[model samples]
Target: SKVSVAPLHLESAKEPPLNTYKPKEPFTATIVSVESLVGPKAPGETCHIVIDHGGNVPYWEGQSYGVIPPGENPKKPGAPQNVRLYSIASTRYGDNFDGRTGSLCVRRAVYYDPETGKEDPSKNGVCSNFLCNSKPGDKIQLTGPSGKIMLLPEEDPNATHIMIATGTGVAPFRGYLRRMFMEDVPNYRFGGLAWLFLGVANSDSLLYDEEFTSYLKQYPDNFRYDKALSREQKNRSGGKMYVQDKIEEYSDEIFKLLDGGAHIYFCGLKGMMPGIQDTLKKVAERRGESWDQKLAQLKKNKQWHVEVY
Candidate 1:
C-alpha cells in the first residue's frame, strides 16, 4: 500500500428478511397488473408487473425475486422451464402500500433484428418474456426475494445515498425511494441527500420518471434526480451521455460524500462497471489519491452495493 486510507467504519445496513419461498417450493402468485413503463417511441418494451400471494412471499426493498416460467426448456430435454431472477421493484409494503403485492420492472428482449438492435442475453429469457406478457388474471411461479447487498442503510437516516441505474436496473432503487419518500414510518425520517443518476436511450425509455419527479417535488431538500439520455444528450467528447459521465460531472461532490459515510449503489448492465471504475480511478489520481484504497475502504464498510445483470 502506498499510503494508508482512513480506517473509518460505518454501521452496516439492516439484515435482510429470511426468504421463505425458495426454488424447490415456489409460491403461486397471481399477476395483479402489468403496465408499460415507457412511451410508444421508446427503445424497448419495458413493463412494471405486480404480483401478489396475500403477502405470503414477503421481501424487502432491495431484494430480488425468482420467476419460473411455465413451459418446457428447449435447451434441456425432459425438463421444466428455467428460473429467472428479477429485482423486486417495489417497497416491502409494495406499490399499493397494502403489504400484499410486489412489483417487478422488466424489459422484453427480442433477438437481434433490423429493429431491436441487439439481444441482451440476460433479458432475453423465457421467464422474463412470460412475466412481461402475462395477464392480470394469470398465475405465476414465484420464488425468493433474496440478496442482502442492495439493502438501504436506513439505520442511518442522515447518510447520503448515491444510486446509479441504467435501463431496467432502476428496479431496486424504485423500492428504496418508495420507502424513503412515499410512506411515512415512525421509526425513520430521511434527512440525508438521496441522489439518483439514471441512464437510458432516450427520455421515452426513462422508467418511473413521473414518480421520481414527484419525489423531488415533495422532498426538494432531500432528493436529487439526474438523467443521462444516451440518444438525446452529448458528452464532452461529442459522444453519447452515459451514467458514468453524469457521475463524473459531480465527481468532486460525490467523492466528498463517499468519504463522509455516503452509501453508493450501482444497478443495471454489468458492462457499466468498467467505465465507472475508470472515471473514479482517473478522478482520484487527479486529486493525488488512489482509487484502489478508496474502493477497498468502501467494500470494507459494506458501503458499496451493486446488483448488475
Candidate 2:
C-alpha cells in the first residue's frame, strides 16, 4: 500500500552532535573482524571491518572516522599520519549493539597506469589498503566520529526515509538500517517507510545482499528495496541501467512521498547527482511544478541530505 502523508509544518531536524575526539588525540582500536562483502572475482575489494575501542569512543549514526595509515616518519616526532575518512557503517550502539564496537565499509581504491596497463600500487589509497588487509587483533589509530550533515531523522517516527546509493556510498545507510532493523534502541521504532535504491555493476558487487533480502522479508510493508545493475540490466531504452533510471521509474511515488514530507538521502559518487536531479526535474515539470523551487524548500527544511565523494 502506498503510504499517504498529511500536510504538516515541521521545523528543521536538530543538527547532529559534534564529536569530542580530535585528530591530535586519536583512539587506538583493535580490529575485531574483516569480512569481504563482495564475491572474490569482483573488480575491487570491499570489506566490512569491526573496530573495538572498548566502549571509549561514542558515536551516532551517519558519522565518519579517520583511519591513519602507518607511514609517518619516525625521525620527525609527532609527525602527522596520513588520514582517510570513512563513513561509519554500524549504528550508534555498534554492530553487535554493544557500546565497545563500531564498523566501517571500505573499498580499496586501486588505480591502473594508463600507459603500461598495469596496476599502480603507488596510486592506491594507503588507508584503504591498510584497512582491507587488516586482521583480527591488529591495532589501528582512528580519529573523528565526525559529520553532522547526514544523520538520519530517527526522532520522527512518522518520517519516511528514501535512501539512494551506489558503490561504497551504501556505508551510512548500513548504519541507518541496522538501527531500524537490528537494534531495540529507544526513541526509534521506525513506524514510517524506508526505501533503498542501490546501484551496482553486477550481482557480485551488491553489498550485504543477504541482510537486505532478510530485511525485506521481515518488514515487507515498511521496507522497499530496489537495485540497478548497470552491467547486467537494461533500462527502458535498452541502455545500461543506473541509479537515476530507478529514480525515474519511481519518480511518481517519490514525488508523492516528497509532497508528504519524506526525507531523501543521496550517497555515492558525485557523478550520479546530475542524472538523478535531471530525472527529478523532468518529473516536476510534468506535474507543473518548479523542481528548483521545491528542492530549495526541501533544503531549507532539511528534508534533503547528501554525502558523496
Candidate 3:
C-alpha cells in the first residue's frame, strides 16, 4: 500500500485529445531556434533544436511528451494528426548542467505519401520535420510525459539500474541515465546495475555517443555498455538485425537481473516490439524460467514495461 504513495496531480496540463487519454498537464514550447547536432549517424543531415519552454512545463527524467504538429485540430476528433511521442533528453538539475527545460533529441522520419505515391519530402513528418523546418519564433506544441515505464528506486543504495534501447528509443532511458549519473541525484547513487544495451542500423546511427560513453567511464566498475550494430555484426549479416537477437546473446545476465527485481524499459520503434517480446519469452523458456509465470510476476510487480512508438 505504501508503494501507492500519493495520487499524481497535474493541473496546468490540458485535457487529453481522446476521452480515453484522461488528462495530464504537458509542456508547450515555441521553436526559438534549430541547429545541426552532426553526429556520426545521419551525418550532416541530422539536426537538433532549441525549444523555448517558457519556463512553465515541469517533468522528471525518463519522461516523454506528445508534440502536436501544425494543422492539427482538437474539435474535429478523428482527423489525421501529427502527434508523436519524444523523450525529454535534458536533466532537470538547472540549465548549468543540462541546456534547458531538458532538450528533446529526435530524428527525422522519412516516409512516403499516398497522395502522390512517392517519397514526398514536402509532405513533412509529424515530429521530425516539425522540429527540423520550424524557424525561429515559431510555436511547437506538446502533451504528456505519461508512460508506465519508469525506474524503480532500489531497496539498497548499492543496487544497479540497467536498461536497453534501440535507435531513438534510447531517448527515455537516456533521461534516466542523465538524472542518475550526470546530475548525481541522491536516489541514483545506489548504483548497482546500470547497463545500457543500444542497437542501431549501424554504428553511425547511434545517438548520444559522447555523453553515453562518458557515463560508462565514470562508473566503469558497475556501469556496462553493450552495443550492437545489426548491419555490421558478423552473425547477423544481410538482414534486419533487431535488438531481440542481441538480447538473446545476453540471456544469462538478463535472467539474473530479472530475478533481482530489475527494471526493464522497451521504447522506440513499434516495428521492433514483437521482436523484443519474442526474444524475452525465448530467453525465459530456455532458462527453464517459466515464461508465463514470470510474465504474471512482471504484470503484478510492474517490473517489465514497454513504450512503442
Candidate 4:
C-alpha cells in the first residue's frame, strides 16, 4: 500500500491542553535564497535555503520551529498544507557567537509509489513540495523541535560516542557536531572518539559527504565515519546490505565500547531497528552472553535509545 501522509490541513488536528505542551513564540521571515549543494547521486540535488527573519526567532540548539504557510491556522500545530519536522542544523549559539541566526539542513523528499517502487509524480510530498516550489520571496509552513531524543555529554570527556544514521535521520547529529567541535564551552570538552555509521542505497545517495569529510579532517583523532552502500556493490559479496552489516563488521569493538559505558544513538528507517537488535542478540550469544539479559541491562541503564517514525 502507498504510505499516506496526512494532508496539510491536518495541521489543525486537535491536541491536549495548550499548557500541556511547550509554549513557543513565533517570528516571520522572508526567503532570501535557495542554494543546492552538489547531490551525491546522478544529477540529483540537496538544497540549503536561507531566510532572513525580519527579527530574531527564539530557538534553542537542536530545537525546530514551524514556518506557517500564509493564511495557515496560526494556532495549529502543522503546515496548512502538511506537517513536517526539521532539526535546526544551525547552532543556536551562532557561528561566530553573534547569536542572531540559523539554518535547517533539510532533505528534499521525492515522492514514490510504494506499490510500484517507482517515483510517483502525481502525489507530492507536502514539505518538499513547498520547499521545491517556493521562490526567493515565497513563504511556507513548519513547526517543531518537539522531539526530545537529545544527547548530553557524560562525566567522562573521553567517553566513546557511536552514532548510526541513514537518510534524513542524520539531521540532528549535525547540530550535535557543531556544538561539540565549534563551541569550546566549559566542561563540554569533546575529547572522545565520535563514530558515525551511515547507510544509504547507493554511494551516490550519500548526503553531506563533503561536510563529513571536512569534519573527519579537522578532528583526525576524535571523529570517524564509515558507510554501507545497501544497493550498490562492487564485489563478490554483493547486493543490498544495510547499516546492520557495518555494525556486525565492527562487533568486537562495539561490544568493548558498550561494556565501557559508551553512548550510542540509532536513527533512520523503522526497519533498521529489528535488524540491529537481531545482530546484537547474535553477537551476545556468540560471546556466551544471554540476549534477554543483555538487552534488559541496556534498557535499565538507559544505554539503548531510539527515535523512529
Candidate 5:
C-alpha cells in the first residue's frame, strides 16, 4: 500500500530497434513450430511459437516481437487488426542457436461472461489464438524486435541475475538462461549465479520445467531454481504462497546477494510489483537499511531491470 516509485532515468542504456522493420513495412516469417507447454486440463494454455527469420531478423535476449494477426475483427468491423507484442522467448541464436530464428511464449487469452460463466468464444485474443493454432509452415507478419530496458548488462560477465517471474512473464528470462546455460555466447561466460523464482498456479502450469531442471543439473553451482505454486502450495502463515513469499523467505540471502552486486530482474504481472517491493522494503527496514536509497542506487547502476504487463 505504498506510493508509486519514481521512474529511473536509464535512457543511456536503452537500445534502438535493431533493423528497419516497422508497422507499415513488416517482415514475413514462417512458423517453425508450435508446442503446448501446459496440459489440456490446466487453467490456461501456453504455446511456444517459433518463427524462422532466415538470419534476416536479428534480435537479442529481452526483446519483443509485434504480431499482426490475419483477417479483420468482426467485433470491431472495418478497422485493421492491431499488432500484439510478445516477449521473445528464445535467445539471439534461437532454439537451434543458429541465429536465424526466434520464438515467443504465447498464452491464449480467453474470457468468460460474468452472467453465463462460460467462455466467450468470440472474445478470444486475435494474435494469441492465431499463433497458438498456427502450423509449422504457416506465414505470419512480424515487426520490431524492440525493447532495451530488460536487457542483461554487457559489461559484467560475472554479474549475478536474480530473476523473478510468473506465467508467460518467464519468456525473456528463458532467453537469458539459454544464453548462459545452453550456449556460452561470446563476451559472457556467466560465471556468477542466476537464480530464478517462478510463481505459477500449480505444478502442471510450470513452464519450461524440464529445461529449468536440466539447467539446475548442469549448472548446479551457478543456477538456482525455486517455484511458488499458489494453488497447490501454502506459505508459512497458511496463505497461498506467492513469488513475494519466496522473497521474504529468502530475504537474508537475497540481501546478501544484493550487497555482493547482484542484479535483480522482475517480469510478470504489474500486480506483483507492489508485494515484491513491500517485501524488499520490510527486509531492508528490519536491517535498518534505506530501501529507497538502495533501489535508487540499483537503478542508477542499471542493476534493477523490470518488464511487467
Candidate 6:
C-alpha cells in the first residue's frame, strides 16, 4: 500500500513571534539552571542553561533570544557590548512542560589559534561566556524570539524533516525533536520522519546523547539520529569523518526523502557549507543529474533552509 504523504497544511500553524521584546527594553529573565553539557575529555565546554521566562516572552522552536552581556565594549570606551543571539533549545512548553522557562545550548567560546594550537582567553565570547557562567537566580537581559528561517513546518504534521547540525548548532533541532517525540501534546502528532545528523569532535563532545538515544528507542520508526565524530571516525577515503561525509554515506536515502517533499535544514559553521555543496554535487553528477537543478527546485519550494555563522 503506497500512500502519498500529502500535507494538510493546518490553519493553526504558529506564526513566528518576532521582536516582542526589543533590545532597548529587553525582558529580564532569571536563570533557573546552568548545567554543563560535556564530558571530562571534551575539548571545550557547552552549557544547557534554562531561563525562567515567567510564561512571558513566548517563542516557538527555531527562534532565538538575544542576550545582552553585562559590561562595556573593549574596542569602544563607554559603550555597551552588542547583544548576541543564541538559538532556543526548548519546546514552547519548556522542560517542566509548564511554559514557564526556556532553554539554550551555548558553547563557551575559547579560541584556539590554528597554527599555534594555543588557547586565546582574550578571544572568549562576551555573551556566551556570561550566559554559561551565570548562576541560579542570576538575572539576564533578553530580547526577541527572532528568526523565521529555521521554523519547523508546523503547518504540516506529516512533513519529513532532515536536520544537519554541528556543535551547538544542535540547539534548534533539540527543540524540534522534543516537540515531535519527547512531549505528548494535545494538538500535534508527528507522522513523518525527523532525521538528524549531528557532527562533533568526539564522543566526549556529543550533546544530548541520552535524550536522543531515548527518543531513538521510544520512536524507532520515526526518529533517526546519526553522528559524525571527526576525532574517532574516518571517512571511506581515509579522511576525518565530517558531517558531509555522514550525509554522503546516506545520499541515496537523502535524495529519496527530498523526492517525497522532505525539508532539509543546515545549521552550523559557515565553513561547512562548501563541503556539503561539493559532496552533493558529486553525488548528483555520479547519478547523471545536476545538483544545481535539485538545489534550485528546493529553493523554489522554500524547502532548502540554512542558518550558519
**Over the stretch 1-309, how does candidate 2's per-residue lDDT look in tens digits?**
212211111112254435556667778889999998998657788999999978667677888888877877445666877668888888766766556788998888888888887886767778888999999999998887788778887668868999999988898898888777766654457778989999988889999878788889888988999999998899888888999899888878998998899999999878889878987888899989999999999999889999998
lDDT of 3 at 221: 76
For residue 140, model 6's alpha carbon misses the true position, in angstroms, by 0.5
Clash totals in order: 0, 0, 7, 7, 0, 0
Please, what are the lDDT tens digits per residue for candidate 6 over residues 187-273?
778888999999999999999989899888888999998999998999999988889999998989999899889999998677888
Q: Hey, what RMSD does candidate 3 come out at?
A: 6.6
TM-scores across all candidates? 0.90, 0.90, 0.77, 0.76, 0.90, 0.92
For model 1, residues 75-156, the per-residue Cα lDDT tens digits are: 8887777778899898777766667788999998766746767666554667768888899899988888788888787778
Report the candidate with higher lDDT, 1 versus 6: 6
TM-score of 4: 0.76
Worst 10 residues of 4 by lDDT: 1-10
TM-score of 5: 0.90
Model 4, range 44-153, lDDT digits (tens) per residue?
Answer: 44466555543245344445545543434345655343345555555544333444445655556676677876886545455655654566876544344355554444
Q: lDDT of model 1 at residue 65?
A: 88
RMSD of each: 7.8, 5.9, 6.6, 9.3, 7.5, 4.9
Model 6: worst 10 consecutive residues (lDDT sum): 1-10
Residue 198 lDDT in model 2? 96
Q: What residue runs in model 1 are displaced by over 4 Å at the alpha carbon? A: 1-15, 114-124
Candidate 5 C-alpha error for residue 137, in Å: 1.2
Q: Report lDDT per candidate.
A: 0.83, 0.82, 0.63, 0.61, 0.83, 0.86
Best by lDDT: 6
